Ligand binder design. Structure first.
Ligand SMILES: *[C@@H]1O[C@H](CO)[C@@H](O[C@@H]2O[C@H](CO)[C@@H](O)[C@H](O)[C@H]2NC(C)=O)[C@H](O)[C@H]1NC(C)=O
Ligand SMILES: *[C@@H]1O[C@H](CO)[C@@H](O[C@@H]2O[C@H](CO)[C@@H](O)[C@H](O)[C@H]2NC(C)=O)[C@H](O)[C@H]1NC(C)=O
Ligand SMILES: CC(=O)N[C@@H]1[C@@H](O)[C@H](O)[C@@H](CO)O[C@H]1O
Lengths: 50, 50
């Protein structure tokens, strides 16, 4: 990799007391991504691979 | 090798194996391009070059 990484805190507009529930992340997949890959598929998942 | 002649018409899905050579012999622009994808059934991004 060659570049710079930046981050800043945003509690002012990205959070609230009731909560904001607009974001998601994929924790289950039959295989890890390659560099800069993307997968936006949403389907039912079963550990058998069927 | 592949060939389209008279009734014959071949459009078979070919595996990519992470990279292909390609060559065509054409008299009057018979082949207009390709299509690259993984599932080709409403489930994965695909690209068209024509
Ligand atoms: C990205 O590539 C991976 C691996 O090359 C694909 O994962 C395969 O998906 C098939 C679908 O039936 C499984 O049978 C295989 O076991 C998986 N792994 C391998 C190594 O083939 C994945 O499908 C590709 N991305 C998309 C969107 O299709
Ligand atoms: C891609 O998705 C569309 C929409 O989900 C599919 O169209 C459906 O086709 C079935 C049978 O072919 C119909 O019973 C549905 O009514 C259609 N959906 C709509 C919204 O009209 C289409 O079949 C999918 N592609 C493939 C190759 O199956
Ligand atoms: C009228 C006719 O039969 N036309 C062609 C013939 O010339 C050719 O030999 C064959 C297969 O090559 O396909 C057909």
């Amino acid at each position: 990799f060659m570049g710079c990484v930046l981050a800043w805190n945003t509690r002012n507009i990205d959070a609230t007391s009731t909560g904001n529930y607009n974001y998601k992340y994929r924790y289950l997949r039959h295989g890890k991504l390659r560099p800069f890959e993307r997968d936006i598929s949403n389907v039912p998942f079963s550990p058998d691979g069927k | 090798g592949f060939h389209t002649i008279n009734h014959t018409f071949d459009n078979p899905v070919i595996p990519f194996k992470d990279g292909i050579y390609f060559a065509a012999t054409e008299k009057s622009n018979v082949v207009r391009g390709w299509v690259f994808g993984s599932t080709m059934n409403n489930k994965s991004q695909s690209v068209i070059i024509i």
